Amino acid sequence: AKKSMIAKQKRTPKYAVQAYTRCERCGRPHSVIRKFKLCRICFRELAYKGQIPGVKKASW
């Protein structure tokens, strides 16, 4: 029961409070970072390749 859900989230719900967020490369609803709209395990395996501009490993 996933591809049904990713459709629902893109449909406007009856009351505005129901609206919520998911990653796009996945449907994962938990741990989405608002600035990039990506989950916590797309933002990792993707900022390695060098496609999230300006992001790098942080020694300090």
Partner RNA sequence: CUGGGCUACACACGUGCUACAAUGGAUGGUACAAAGGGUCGCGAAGCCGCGAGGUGGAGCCAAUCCCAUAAAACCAUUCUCAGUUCGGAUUGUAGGCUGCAACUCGCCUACAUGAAGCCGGAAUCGCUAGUAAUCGUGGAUCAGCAUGCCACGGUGAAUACGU
Q: Show contacts with Zn ion in window 10-39 (CB under 5 A).
A: 23, 25-26, 39
Amino acid at 9: Q
Report the half-sphere exposure of 46 (CA within 13 A, side-chain side).
15
Say whether 50 counts as a known binding-site residue: no
| 44 lines the binding site for Zn ion (CB under 5 A) | no
What is the pattern of x (binds RNA, CB under 7 A) and - over residues 1-40?
A: -------x-----xxxxx-xx----------xxxx-----
The response to whether 26 counts as a known ligand-binding position is: yes
Handedness of CA 22, 38, 2, 5 (dihedral sign): positive
